[PDB]
Each structure stands twice: as structure tokens, then as C-alpha cells.
Symmetry: C12
Subunit: 70 residues, 12 copies
């Protein structure tokens, strides 16, 4: 039931899915062009993700901007 | 059980369903003309979606506008 | 247990039910004339819907108006 | 447990029950005269309803008036 | 488990219980004189009700007055 | 687990229990004199009640007064 | 888990337990003198109670005074 | 799992446990001197309690003072 | 899963555990000197406690002070 | 799932774990020096704790200071 | 179902996964360059994580900044 | 499922995991340099932790600063 939203602020965003289990590798990379949105769950096969590029990210904890200086 | 809403702001918005499981591919593409709405769940077969085009997207985290510059 | 409400703002509204499973196709189209309302669930057979025409749409995320310039 | 309330604002309201399952047909039509109220659940046999005529409709998401211009 | 309240504002308010299942019929009629109250559940046998007459009706969505013109 | 409270405002109040199942009839009538209170559950045997007389009635939806001009 | 509290405002309060099941009879009467408090549950054997005399009564729905004029 | 708190305002406050089941009797009496506190649950053996004496009583409904005149 | 907290305001505080079941007796007494704190659960073996001495007592219903003139 | 936090305000704090079951004895003492923190659960083996020394204690019910005069 | 978010404030951030069970060791290290984000769950294999570098960290308890002088 | 956060305010903060079960011992020590963060659960093997050093600690009860004098 846990899910997250990624919106690409610019071209060049990638979302990597990381394998659930003893081993940790990237099993999929989804590219996002500017304006594209991926809505994705954690699943049997995906227990972590890594996001690269200029993006807005939403989870239960709020909205995160990758370009912002905190 | 988790579900999301997509309303097209222009013709040709495209909603791709991504397969649940070890493999990740687009198993379905649903196009939306301006003003059309898709309401869709995550399911046994669909564990992520990719959306392209000028659209309003709603999840339990709130409403996103794909056009908005952050 | 998730349900949605559609009210036709004008004649010509259609609600398509999309099949649950590996196969995705329309299994039903319900036509709504001005003012008519459909209240419908996601179900064993329906895991997504597509709505066409000038309509008010309600989900747990709130009320959408297809005609609104967003 | 999901239920809805319909109050007829005038004579000529009908509430159609739509069959749950692979097939979608109207299995019952209940007529409401002005002032009459139907309170009804979704059930094993009913997974969607269609409402016609001048009516006030209540669900979890609020109260809807079929005659109103949104 | 879902339940509703009906208070008669006049004599001869009538509460019809509608059968759960494939068939839909009135299996019981309970009449209420002015000020009398019925508190009733949905059950194995009752999946909808139809109410006629001047009455106050309460559900988890709030209080409805059958006389009020909207 | 749903329960209701009835307080008699005057002598002459009666609380009828209505049988659960295909058959609907009164299986019990409890008389309340002024000020007396009944607190009762819905149960295996009771799926609806009817209240007659001048009474204060409490459910999870709030407090009703049978004598009130609504 | 459903429970209620009775405090006697004066001598002469009685709390009657009513039998759960097909039959409805008083299986116990507990007398309360002024100031005494009974805290009691609904149970396998008790599905309703009747309270007589001058008392303060508390349930989930609030506090009720038997002597008050509503 | 439901529990209650009793603090004595005077010596000789008395807490009687009432048996769960078909029979209702006091199976235990616990006396409290001024300022002493009992925190007790309802249990397999105890489905009601009777309290006599000047005391503060707390339940999930709030705090009661047995001395207070209403 | 219910727990309680006792802080000794002065030397001489005692917390008695009362046995769960048909038999009710003290199975343990824990002595607390000034400032010492006990945090304890209800359990398979303990269904009530009695607290003696000058103490601050905390439950989900709030904080009590045994020395307070109520 | 029930847990508590202890922070030592000064050297000389001890946290005693009390055995769950028919018998009640201290099965472990953990010493805390000034500034050290113990976060601990209730468990199969621990159903109560006793805390000695100058400490800040946190539970669901709030923060308690052992040195404070209430 | 608990998850956490890590955003790298600068290059050089590392997220170590710590093994669940009797054995505790690092089974994975994910490196994050400036702006990159990891969203990850606790899992069958990971019961703790250690984060090194200049990072924004989000959990259900809120947002932490590793560089902040606390 | 319960989890906690520890951020080091100085080098050499030390987090000791304490064994679940009849025996209580430190089964693991994780040291943190200034700014490093551990996010950790209670588990089958870990039912308490002991933390030494200048640190910010977060639980569902709030944030604690080990340096703060109360
Ligand atoms: N294979 C790892 C992936 C992972 C999840 N959460 C992590 C946190 C840190 C490092 C790796 C992970 C797992 O399922 O446990
Ligand atoms: N429901 C899990 C993810 C998940 C789905 N199927 C699974 C099977 C095994 C392990 C985890 C999962 C979550 O929200 O976090
Ligand atoms: N209920 C899941 C989706 C889902 C439905 N059927 C499934 C079967 C297997 C795995 C996941 C699912 C969710 O809301 O996220
Ligand atoms: N087949 C993948 C699809 C997926 C879900 N969430 C993801 C996040 C990142 C990359 C891929 C995914 C899965 O079910 O796990
Ligand atoms: N047959 C698809 C229908 C579907 C649900 N959600 C979707 C999102 C995108 C595309 C298709 C879908 C399924 O049950 O999984
Ligand atoms: N409750 C499901 C829909 C549903 C009903 N019956 C089903 C049987 C199989 C799969 C899904 C369903 C949902 O909202 O997601
Ligand atoms: N027979 C369909 C009825 C239905 C429910 N929800 C729908 C949404 C759109 C179209 C039809 C429906 C079903 O049970 O799935
Ligand atoms: N409880 C379901 C409706 C329902 C009742 N019985 C059913 C049997 C099968 C499928 C659905 C149902 C709901 O609220 O939505
Ligand atoms: N509990 C259901 C009604 C109900 C009771 N018994 C049933 C048996 C079958 C189907 C429904 C029911 C509700 O609140 O809506
Ligand atoms: N026999 C129908 C009664 C019913 C319930 N909800 C309805 C809505 C519309 C029409 C009929 C109904 C059923 O149990 O499904
Ligand atoms: N015997 C009916 C009693 C009943 C409950 N709710 C009702 C509503 C209307 C009419 C009768 C009823 C039943 O158990 O279903
Ligand atoms: N808990 C049910 C009433 C009830 C108790 N026991 C029952 C046995 C069968 C049917 C209903 C019941 C309700 O409030 O709706
Ligand atoms: N023997 C009845 C007692 C009862 C409970 N609620 C009632 C309401 C009205 C009349 C009687 C009752 C029963 O268990 O069902
Ligand atoms: N737990 C029920 C009462 C109850 C206890 N044991 C029971 C056994 C049978 C029926 C009801 C009960 C309530 O709070 O309402
Ligand atoms: N858990 C019940 C009391 C209880 C405990 N054990 C029981 C065994 C039988 C009946 C009731 C009980 C309550 O909080 O009210
Ligand atoms: N033996 C009775 C005790 C009781 C509980 N609640 C009551 C209310 C009134 C009278 C007696 C009781 C029972 O378990 O049911
Ligand atoms: N042995 C009694 C102890 C008890 C619990 N709650 C009580 C209230 C009053 C008197 C005694 C008790 C029991 O388990 O039931
Ligand atoms: N969780 C129970 C106490 C308890 C723990 N283990 C038990 C075993 C039997 C009876 C009660 C218990 C309560 O708070 O009421
Ligand atoms: N061995 C006791 C310890 C205990 C828990 N709560 C208590 C309260 C008072 C006295 C002792 C205790 C038990 O598990 O029950
Ligand atoms: N989960 C219990 C403690 C506990 C863990 N394992 C247990 C085994 C038996 C009894 C109690 C426990 C609590 O939070 O209170
Ligand atoms: N292997 C340890 C890892 C761990 C989790 N939480 C901890 C807290 C402190 C030290 C180690 C840990 C465990 O699963 O229990
Ligand atoms: N849901 C667990 C993590 C988890 C997933 N699968 C597991 C299998 C075994 C143990 C733990 C897990 C938690 O957050 O604590
Ligand atoms: N879920 C427990 C910890 C836990 C995980 N696996 C366990 C196995 C046995 C006992 C406890 C556990 C908690 O949050 O506190
Ligand atoms: N081995 C102990 C560890 C522990 C948990 N909570 C405690 C509180 C005090 C002392 C020790 C502990 C246990 O699992 O129970």
C-alpha cells in the first residue's frame, strides 16, 4: 500500500527500482522527461528506490524538491 | 485499493500501466482527450503508472498539475 | 470498497468500465444524460474507469469538473 | 457497508441497480415520488447504481443536487 | 451494522424493507404515527429501505427532512 | 456493537424489539414510565426497534426528542 | 466492550439486566443507594438494561439525568 | 481491556466485583482508605462493579465524583 | 496492552498486583521510595492493582494525585 | 508495541525489568550515567519496570521528571 | 510498512542497510550524489540503516538535517 | 515495527542493541560520528537499546536532546 509520486521538473530524471531480498541491485530504470509523472508502489519485488535528476517527489511525509537547498 | 485520478488538460494525455512482478513493462496505454478522466487502481497486474501530457493528477497526497513549473 | 460518483452536466456523458486483470478493455459503457448520476464501485471485474463528456466527478480526493479550465 | 441516500425533489425519480459481475445490466428500478427516500447499500448483487430525475443524493463525499448547475 | 433512524412528523409514515439478494421486493412495511421512531439496521435480509411520508431521517451522513424543499 | 438509549419524558413510553431474519414481528415490548431509561443493543434476535410515546432517544447520530415540532 | 455508568442521585435506584436471546426477561436487579455507582458491560447474558429512579447515566453518547426535563 | 480508576476520598470506600455469566453476585470486595487507588479491568470473571463511598471514578467517559449533587 | 505509571511523591508507596481469575488476592507488592517510578501492564496474571501512599498515577484517562483534596 | 524512554538527569539511574508471569522478580538492572538514554519495550519476559534515580521518563501519557514536586 | 526518505544535500552521502537477525552487519551501501533521493523500507532483510554525509532525512517523526547544529 | 531515530551531535555516540528474551545483553554496538544518523526498529532480536553520547533522539513521543539539562 506504500506508494510515492515523482514529477520530472526537467528532462533527465530516472527512477531506479531496487530489489527486495538478500541482494540489492537495480532491476529497472524508468526515465522521466520534463512534466512526466510516475506513481509507484513498493511491492514484492521493489523495497527501495533511487531517484536522480531534477524532480518533485511526494510521499506520506510531504513534498520534496531535488533542486532545493535545505 | 490505492487509486489515483487523472484529468486531461489537453488531447493525447497518455497513461501507461506498468506490470507488477519481476519484469517491468507497459502492458496498457490509455489515451485521454481534453477533459476526459481516468480513475484507476493499483492491482494484481499494475504496480506503477507513467503519465505523459498536460494533466491534473490526484492521489491521497493531493493534486498535482503536470504543467506547473516548480 | 472504493466508490466514485459521476453527475452529467450535459447530455452525452459516458462512463466506461475497464476490465481487471492482464487484459485491459472496456466491458461496459454507461450513458448519462444531463443531471443523471452514477455511483459505482471498483470490483472484481472493474479496476479502472474512463469518463467522457461534461461531468462532475467525486472521489475521496474531492470533486472534479471536467469542463474547468485548470 | 458502502451506502447512499436518495431523496426525490419531485415525482419521476428512478434508482436503477446495476448487476455485479462480468455482465452489467439493470436488475431493478425503484421509482421515487416527491419526498420519498431510498437508503441503499452496495451488495453482492449491486455494484453500481444510476439515478434519474430531480433528486438530492448523499454519499460519504457529500450531498449532490441533480438539478443544480455546477 | 450500518443503521438508520426514522422519526415520523405525521401519521402513516411508512418504512418498507427491501430484500437482499438477486430479487428486490418489499418484505415488510412498518407504519409510524406522528412522533414514533424506528431505529433499524441493514441485515442479512434487508439491503435497502424506502420511506414515504413526512419524516426526519438520520444516517451517518446527517439528518434529512423529507418535507424540506431544496 | 451498536446500542441506543431511550429516556421516557412521560409515562406511556414503549420500546418494541423487532425480530431479525426473514420474519419481522415484535418479540418484546418494554414499557417505560416517566424518567426511566433503557439502554439496549442490536443483537442476534433484534435488528430494529420501534419507539412510541414521549421520549428522548440517543444514538451515535445524536439526540432526538419525539415531542419536538420538526 | 460496550459499557455504561450509573450514579444514584438518591436512594431507590434500580438497574435491571435484560436477558440476551430469543427471550427477554429481567435476570438481575441491582439496587443503588444515593451516591453509589455501578459500571457495567453488555455481555453474553445481558443485551439491554432498564434503569429506574433518580440517576445520572453515562454512555458513549454523553451524560443523561433521569430527573431533568428535556 | 476496558478498565476504570477509583480513588477514595474517605476511608472505607468499597469496590465490589460482580460475576460475569448467568449468575450475578459479588465475588470480591476491595476496600480503599482515603487516597488509595484501584485500577481495575473488566475480565473473564468480572463484567460489572458496584462502588460505595466518597470517591473519584474515572472511565473513558470522564471523571465522576460520587459526592457531587446534580 | 493497557499500562499505568506510578511515581512515589514520598517514601512508603506500595503497588499491589491483584490476581486475574475467579480468585482475587495480592500476588505482589512493589515498594517505591520518593521519586521512584513503576510502569506496569495488565497481564495474564494481573487484572487489577491497588496503590497506597502519596503518589502520582497516570493512565490513559490522565494524571491523578493521591494527596489532592478532591 | 508498548515502549518507554528513560533519560538519566544524573549518574546513578537504574532501570529494573520485572518478570512477566506468576512470579515477579527483577531479571535485569540497567544502569544509566548522566545523559544516557534507554528506549525499551514491554515484552514476553518483561511486563513491568521500576526506575530509580534522577530521570526524565516518557510514555504515551507524557513526560515525567523524577525530581519534580507534583 | 515503515519507510524513510534520504535526500543528499551534497555529494558523498551513503545509506547503509543493516541486516535483520542475530547478526548485525552492513549488507548494502547506496551512494547518493547531491540532490539524489532514496526512498526505502524496512524489510525482511533490513531492520536498521545508518546514514553518512550531508543529508535531509524524513521519517514519520519529521525531517532531520544532518548538517544542523542542534 | 516501532522504530527510533538517533542523530549524533558529536563523534563516538554509541548505540547498543539489547537482546530480546530471558537474557539481557548488548549484542551489537553501532558508533556514530557527528551528524551521522541511525534509524532502527525493535525486532525479534532487539527489544531495547541504550544510547550514550551527545545526540538527538526521536521516537513517536517526540524529540529528545541528550545534552539538555532538565
Ligand atoms: N534488498 C534490500 C533493499 C533495501 C531496502 N531497504 C534498504 C535500506 C538500506 C539499504 C538497502 C535497502 C532489502 O530488501 O532489504
Ligand atoms: N504491501 C507492501 C509491499 C508488498 C507487496 N507484496 C509484497 C510481498 C512481499 C513483501 C512485501 C510486499 C508495502 O506496502 O510495503
Ligand atoms: N490491494 C493492492 C493491489 C492489489 C490487488 N490485488 C493484488 C494481488 C497481488 C498484489 C497486489 C494486489 C493495493 O492497493 O496496492
Ligand atoms: N515490476 C515492478 C514495477 C515497479 C513498481 N514500483 C517500482 C519502482 C521503481 C521501479 C519499478 C517499479 C514491481 O512490481 O516491483
Ligand atoms: N487490467 C488493468 C486495468 C488497470 C488498472 N489500473 C491501471 C492503470 C493503468 C493502466 C491500466 C490499469 C489491471 O487490472 O491492472
Ligand atoms: N475491494 C476491491 C475490489 C474488489 C471486490 N471484489 C474483488 C475480488 C477480487 C479483486 C478485487 C475485488 C478494491 O476496491 O480494490
Ligand atoms: N458489472 C460491473 C458493474 C460496474 C461496477 N462499477 C462499474 C464502473 C463502470 C462500469 C460498470 C461498473 C461490475 O461489477 O464490475
Ligand atoms: N460489503 C461490500 C458489498 C458486498 C456485500 N456482499 C458482497 C459479496 C460479494 C461482493 C461484494 C459484496 C461493499 O460495501 O462494497
Ligand atoms: N453487516 C452488514 C449487514 C449484514 C448483516 N448480516 C449479513 C449477512 C449477509 C450480508 C449482509 C449482512 C451491514 O452492516 O451492512
Ligand atoms: N436485492 C437488491 C436490493 C438493493 C440494494 N441496493 C440497491 C440499489 C439499487 C437497486 C436495488 C438495490 C440487492 O440486495 O442488491
Ligand atoms: N426482520 C428484518 C427487520 C428489519 C431490519 N431492518 C429493517 C428495515 C425495514 C424493515 C424491516 C427491517 C431484518 O432482520 O432484516
Ligand atoms: N453486532 C451485530 C448484532 C449481532 C450480535 N450477534 C449477532 C449474531 C448474528 C447476527 C447479528 C448479531 C450488529 O450490531 O449488527
Ligand atoms: N432478548 C433481547 C433483548 C433486547 C435487546 N435489545 C432490545 C431492543 C428492544 C427489545 C428487546 C431487546 C435480545 O437479546 O435481542
Ligand atoms: N462484546 C459484546 C457483548 C458480549 C460479550 N460476550 C458475548 C457473547 C455473545 C454475544 C455478545 C457478547 C458487546 O460489547 O456488545
Ligand atoms: N476483554 C473484555 C473482558 C474479558 C477478558 N477476558 C474475557 C473472557 C470472556 C469474556 C470477556 C472477557 C473487555 O475488555 O470487556
Ligand atoms: N452476570 C451479569 C452481570 C452484569 C453485567 N452487566 C449487567 C447489567 C445489569 C445487570 C447485571 C449485569 C452478566 O455478566 O451479564
Ligand atoms: N480476580 C478478579 C480481579 C478483578 C479485576 N477487576 C475487578 C473489579 C472488582 C473486583 C475484582 C476485580 C478478576 O480477574 O476478575
Ligand atoms: N492484553 C490483556 C492482558 C493480557 C495479556 N495476556 C493475557 C492472557 C490472558 C488474559 C489477559 C491477558 C489486557 O490488557 O486486558
Ligand atoms: N509478574 C507480574 C508483574 C506485574 C505486571 N504488572 C503488575 C502490577 C502490579 C504488580 C506486579 C505486576 C505480571 O506479569 O503480572
Ligand atoms: N506486545 C506486548 C508485549 C509482548 C511481546 N511478546 C509477548 C508475548 C507474550 C505476552 C506479551 C508479549 C505489549 O506491547 O504489551
Ligand atoms: N540485527 C539487528 C539489527 C538492529 C535492529 N535494531 C537495532 C538496534 C540496535 C542495534 C542493532 C539493531 C536486529 O535485527 O535486531
Ligand atoms: N513490515 C516489517 C518489515 C518486514 C517485511 N517483511 C518481513 C518479514 C520478516 C520480518 C520483518 C519483515 C516492519 O516494518 O517491521
Ligand atoms: N513487531 C515488533 C518487533 C518484532 C518483530 N519480530 C518479532 C518477533 C518476535 C517478537 C517481537 C518482534 C515491534 O514492533 O515491537
Ligand atoms: N531481554 C529483555 C530486554 C528488555 C526489554 N525491556 C526491558 C526493560 C527493562 C529491562 C530489560 C528489558 C526482554 O526482552 O524483556
Amino acid at each position: 500500500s506504500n506508494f510515492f509520486v515523482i514529477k520530472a521538473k526537467e528532462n533527465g530524471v530516472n527512477v531506479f527500482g531496487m530489489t527486495r531480498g538478500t541482494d540489492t541491485r537495480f532491476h529497472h530504470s524508468e526515465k522521466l522527461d520534463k512534466g512526466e509523472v510516475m506513481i509507484a508502489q513498493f511491492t514484492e519485488h521493489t523495497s527501495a528506490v533511487k531517484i536522480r535528476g531534477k524532480a518533485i517527489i511526494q510521499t506520506s511525509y510531504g513534498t520534496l524538491d531535488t533542486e532545493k537547498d535545505e
